[PDB]
Design a protein around this ligand. Structure first.
Ligand SMILES: *C(N)c1ncn(C[C@@H](O)COc2cc(Cl)ccc2Cl)n1
Ligand SMILES: *[C@@H](N)c1ncn(C[C@@H](O)COc2cc(Cl)ccc2Cl)n1
Ligand SMILES: [Cl-]
Ligand code: NA
Lengths: 306, 305
């Protein structure tokens, strides 16, 4: 029993992190087979903050302008190309520690592990969720760009995030590993702001199901709700709409606990109305929204504590 | 910016985890040099679990009774012995992935990373603190015994915890890697209960400093206090006493933020007396006590491994 924000073991990703230098700028890259992936803004100068023309900056570079260091070893860059907002540096050595992997673009609400890195060397690992406004609430300092987010369902690493920048509110924006930004953000230092963020409703429900599995029922009630009335109430607290897809996705947790999804919805409605009145759920005094249904099933007993 | 509960990168430990089987029991072991460490309770069966005589259970076993798998490779056990509550299985091969390491015993309040494992296969990593009552609030299912906790101090892994059991309240108990329990617990299936826990004061203060560094300031005030007056408040709210050593340890964060420790104690006093009045601190509606001073400095500075 117990319930913690739990990351994937990071070793398969640690073996892929390198340092990329261009001019006076150093950040991190991801070395898979014979390609190093990193944010294209590594080629930007002080003059290129606001309106970089990346095509024009890149054509002026040779292979030997990029320094890639993997531990104590220099790799030799033998090619370069840009794909969307990522740079792909072809190197003369395949990474002998390359795991089985794939690149996946995630949807808001999905969670992943972040391996924060500086100078190509891992600092720490933590769990994040892609917020509804396409930001993440990470922990990143200068030099952390090119740190990646991933899942490891089975033995295969799914890379889903590469870190590019911090927005004025202190939240974080980045790309998939094909270099497409999450959300309406661009790799320019112009005024950009994330939209108002909302709570990830399906994840809160999942977490309430985790609480029941771990043996806590205090917040349930005798009521039910229609999906439409739930959404009308939940929107007034800045909760995302719950869809029929979300209801379907919660089916297994429902089945395991004997609590219908719309009955759990009625519990959530009452929690929003009442607060917790001095109580906690799985150790928290707020409703937690960074655990998915899949995360709950992965972490929790398949046997409910009745 | 930002502040997150963050574990050490786990790869140096992942390369040391193996599966240990004895009879119908499988759990995890730690393979360092030519020794595999695991809980001695692996040798227990159902009728023994109430009052095991470990000496007597062990003498009946041959080397070949212990099946050790490192990935898909069987290791050959060439010796077996007990140290306190851990079993030490001598194997014929040194682990080529053995990191620089030490065995250390930590103090209550100290944090560490746990690499949860099942069948010798790492499943997840999270940060824990050794509670004042010598339990940890972990997340462990059947098959997780022998999972380890660690810190990394440079390139050196300090192993500090091996998982043995779950108490009735759903919190967790285990040993150092020399097999000495944290807390007044024993390795048998009997009525055992955690003592009442307290809040780790120095760590709450550290976290308040993290909050200020990350721009969250509403709880600061004009007031200061003394160690003695604050300690009367701490005791009333089931907080650990704050010592002068704690004050010294927080010195850096005091200097950096311009909030003396006893000034921050006056903030904490008011929070304990009045609550948060609807507000949050670093996204929490409770006072967090599982970040140490060193954790806060390390994450607000970007140290790597
Ligand atoms: C750890 N891998 C694990 N998995 C299941 N369990 C529960 C029981 O197997 C515990 O068994 C014992 C524990 C102790 Cl502390 C003494 C004796 C026994 Cl049989 N643990
Ligand atoms: C990432 N490693 C990092 N470290 C510091 N910074 C701040 C600036 O250096 C980033 O500069 C740019 C960012 C973008 Cl998105 C476009 C252009 C530039 Cl110059 N980032
Ligand atoms: Cl005063
Ligand atoms: Na004060």
């Amino acid at each position: 029993s117990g319930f913690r924000k739990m990351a994937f073991p990071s070793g398969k990703v640690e073996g892929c992190m390198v340092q990329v230098t261009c001019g006076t700028t150093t950040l991190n890259g991801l070395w898979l087979d014979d390609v190093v992936y990193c944010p294209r803004h590594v080629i930007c100068t002080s003059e290129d903050m606001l309106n970089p023309n990346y095509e024009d900056l890149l054509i002026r570079k040779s292979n030997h302008n990029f320094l890639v260091q993997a531990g104590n070893v220099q790799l030799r860059v033998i090619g370069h190309s840009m794909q969307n907002c990522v740079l792909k540096l072809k190197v003369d050595t395949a990474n002998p520690k390359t795991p089985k992997y794939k690149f996946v673009r995630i949807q808001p609400g999905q969670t992943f592990s972040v391996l924060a890195c500086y100078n190509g060397s891992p600092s720490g690992v933590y769990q994040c969720a892609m917020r509804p406004n396409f930001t993440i609430k990470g922990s990143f300092l200068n030099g952390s760009c090119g740190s990646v987010g991933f899942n490891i369902d089975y033995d295969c690493v799914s890379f889903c995030y590469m870190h590019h920048m911090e927005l004025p509110t202190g939240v974080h924006a980045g790309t998939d590993l094909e270099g497409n930004f999450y959300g309406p953000f661009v790799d320019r230092q112009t005024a950009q702001a994330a939209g108002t963020d909302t709570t990830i409703t399906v994840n809160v429900l999942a977490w309430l199901y985790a609480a029941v599995i771990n043996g806590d029922r205090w917040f349930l009630n005798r009521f039910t709700t229609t999906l439409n009335d739930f959404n009308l109430v939940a929107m007034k607290y800045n909760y995302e709409p719950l869809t029929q897809d979300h209801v379907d996705i919660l089916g297994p947790l429902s089945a395991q606990t004997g609590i219908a999804v719309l009955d759990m919805c009625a519990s959530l409605k009452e929690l929003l109305q009442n607060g917790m009145n001095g109580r906690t759920i799985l150790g928290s005094a707020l409703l937690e929204d960074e655990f998915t249904p899949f995360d709950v099933v992965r972490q929790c007993s398949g046997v409910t504590f009745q």
